[PDB]
Design a protein around this motif. Structure first.
Motif, PDB file in Angstrom:
ATOM      1  N   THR A   1      -8.667   6.344  -0.755  1.00  0.00           N
ATOM      2  CA  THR A   1      -9.645   5.972  -1.777  1.00  0.00           C
ATOM      3  C   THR A   1     -10.867   5.360  -1.124  1.00  0.00           C
TER       4      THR A   1
ATOM      5  N   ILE B   1       1.434  -7.449   4.088  1.00  0.00           N
ATOM      6  CA  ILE B   1       1.121  -6.175   3.425  1.00  0.00           C
ATOM      7  C   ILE B   1       2.173  -5.168   3.853  1.00  0.00           C
TER       8      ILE B   1
ATOM      9  N   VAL C   1       0.858  -1.194   0.000  1.00  0.00           N
ATOM     10  CA  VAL C   1       0.000   0.000   0.000  1.00  0.00           C
ATOM     11  C   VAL C   1       0.883   1.228   0.000  1.00  0.00           C
TER      12      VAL C   1
ATOM     13  N   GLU D   1      -4.949   3.009 -10.042  1.00  0.00           N
ATOM     14  CA  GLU D   1      -6.130   3.341  -9.282  1.00  0.00           C
ATOM     15  C   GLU D   1      -6.476   4.829  -9.303  1.00  0.00           C
TER      16      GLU D   1
ATOM     17  N   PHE E   1      -6.190   2.703   1.446  1.00  0.00           N
ATOM     18  CA  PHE E   1      -5.079   3.339   0.758  1.00  0.00           C
ATOM     19  C   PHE E   1      -4.919   2.697  -0.623  1.00  0.00           C
ATOM     20  N   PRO E   2      -4.352   3.435  -1.598  1.00  0.00           N
ATOM     21  CA  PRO E   2      -4.029   2.799  -2.875  1.00  0.00           C
ATOM     22  C   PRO E   2      -3.039   1.649  -2.672  1.00  0.00           C
ATOM     23  N   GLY E   3      -3.162   0.608  -3.480  1.00  0.00           N
ATOM     24  CA  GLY E   3      -2.243  -0.527  -3.360  1.00  0.00           C
ATOM     25  C   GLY E   3      -2.844  -1.766  -3.977  1.00  0.00           C
ATOM     26  N   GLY E   4      -2.157  -2.879  -3.781  1.00  0.00           N
ATOM     27  CA  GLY E   4      -2.594  -4.125  -4.379  1.00  0.00           C
ATOM     28  C   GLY E   4      -1.536  -5.188  -4.332  1.00  0.00           C
TER      29      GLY E   4
ATOM     30  N   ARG F   1     -13.193   2.297  -2.257  1.00  0.00           N
ATOM     31  CA  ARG F   1     -13.225   1.196  -3.214  1.00  0.00           C
ATOM     32  C   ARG F   1     -14.567   1.170  -3.923  1.00  0.00           C
TER      33      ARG F   1
ATOM     34  N   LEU G   1     -16.254  -4.074  -6.602  1.00  0.00           N
ATOM     35  CA  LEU G   1     -15.114  -4.923  -6.251  1.00  0.00           C
ATOM     36  C   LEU G   1     -15.592  -6.047  -5.341  1.00  0.00           C
TER      37      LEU G   1
ATOM     38  N   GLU H   1     -12.405   0.742 -10.223  1.00  0.00           N
ATOM     39  CA  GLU H   1     -11.760   0.363  -8.960  1.00  0.00           C
ATOM     40  C   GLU H   1     -11.992   1.317  -7.809  1.00  0.00           C
TER      41      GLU H   1
HETATM   42  C1  LIG Z   1      -6.476  -6.732   2.987  1.00  0.00           C
HETATM   43  O1  LIG Z   1      -5.241  -6.501   2.315  1.00  0.00           O
HETATM   44  C2  LIG Z   1      -5.115  -5.386   1.528  1.00  0.00           C
HETATM   45  C3  LIG Z   1      -5.604  -4.154   1.941  1.00  0.00           C
HETATM   46  C4  LIG Z   1      -5.453  -3.047   1.125  1.00  0.00           C
HETATM   47  C5  LIG Z   1      -4.815  -3.134  -0.104  1.00  0.00           C
HETATM   48  C6  LIG Z   1      -4.685  -1.922  -0.988  1.00  0.00           C
HETATM   49  C7  LIG Z   1      -5.748  -1.909  -2.063  1.00  0.00           C
HETATM   50  O2  LIG Z   1      -6.208  -2.953  -2.508  1.00  0.00           O
HETATM   51  N1  LIG Z   1      -6.111  -0.680  -2.504  1.00  0.00           N
HETATM   52  C8  LIG Z   1      -7.110  -0.381  -3.457  1.00  0.00           C
HETATM   53  C9  LIG Z   1      -7.823   0.804  -3.314  1.00  0.00           C
HETATM   54  C10 LIG Z   1      -8.800   1.127  -4.235  1.00  0.00           C
HETATM   55  C11 LIG Z   1      -9.077   0.288  -5.300  1.00  0.00           C
HETATM   56  C12 LIG Z   1      -8.346  -0.867  -5.437  1.00  0.00           C
HETATM   57 CL1  LIG Z   1      -8.668  -1.941  -6.770  1.00  0.00          CL
HETATM   58  C13 LIG Z   1      -7.367  -1.222  -4.534  1.00  0.00           C
HETATM   59  C14 LIG Z   1      -4.330  -4.373  -0.504  1.00  0.00           C
HETATM   60  C15 LIG Z   1      -4.474  -5.496   0.300  1.00  0.00           C
END
Ligand SMILES: COc1ccc(CC(=O)Nc2cccc(Cl)c2)cc1
Length: 186
Positions: free
Chosen positions: A45, A108, A29, A83, A60-63, A47, A51, A127
């Motif tokens: 953000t 994470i 993140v 994102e 937070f932004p991330g993935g 979501r 999703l 997203e």
């Molecule tokens: C539970 O583990 C996590 C928690 C947070 C994340 C970060 C994330 O996914 N952010 C995101 C923000 C808006 C849109 C999208 Cl597609 C993604 C990843 C893993």
């Protein structure tokens, strides 16, 4: 300066790549720090409701890391670009904070990034439903609601919209606020 002071504080908590090679399911993140109106803010953000995991929640932004990523910081930056349109020249990654262990098999890794003052979010609506700022100082005196787990409610004074911030996202926001804002002369 405010920004040099924030970076200096953050660097003292950097763990670097210490935990980065461990064989987990890996996500990163970005904790994006924005300076506006003479104060630091965090960018969040909301979501998208379509999703599968956590629709409509503040995040937070991330993935998930993918094979293209040189390192965990790259994951954060790639996902933030996808994102919210944040380009790499618009972010200075200052440090890696303590990673978050979840579900026994997942790690994470949070990175704090200083965001360019001319950045304006271009969220991918597939997203991200919304992007908003919260002043960092809010997290020192949040409005807490008990659901028993603690939920922060932040109301944007620009428009009166209230956002709920909870879990890992709330915890990381408080950590960053402590690191940067503790023990400061006025
Ligand atoms: C539970 O583990 C996590 C928690 C947070 C994340 C970060 C994330 O996914 N952010 C995101 C923000 C808006 C849109 C999208 Cl597609 C993604 C990843 C893993």
């Amino acid at each position: 300066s405010m920004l040099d002071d924030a970076k200096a504080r953050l660097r003292k908590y950097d763990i670097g790549g210490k935990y980065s090679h461990l064989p987990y399911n890996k996500y990163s993140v970005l904790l994006p720090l924005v300076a506006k109106e003479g104060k630091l803010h965090l960018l969040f953000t909301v979501r998208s409701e379509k999703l599968r995991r956590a629709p409509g929640e503040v995040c937070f932004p991330g993935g998930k890391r993918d094979p293209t990523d040189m390192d965990d910081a790259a994951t954060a930056l790639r996902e933030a670009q996808e994102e919210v349109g944040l380009r790499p020249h618009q972010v200075e990654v200052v440090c890696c904070l303590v990673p978050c262990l979840i579900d026994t098999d997942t790690l994470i890794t949070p990175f704090v990034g200083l965001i360019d003052h001319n950045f304006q979010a271009q969220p991918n609506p597939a997203e991200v439903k919304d992007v908003f700022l919260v002043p960092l100082a809010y997290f020192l005196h949040p409005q807490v609601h008990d659901q028993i787990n603690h939920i922060f409610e932040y109301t944007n004074p620009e428009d009166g919209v209230t956002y709920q911030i909870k879990g890992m996202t709330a915890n990381l926001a408080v950590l960053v606020a402590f690191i940067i804002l503790e023990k400061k002369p006025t």
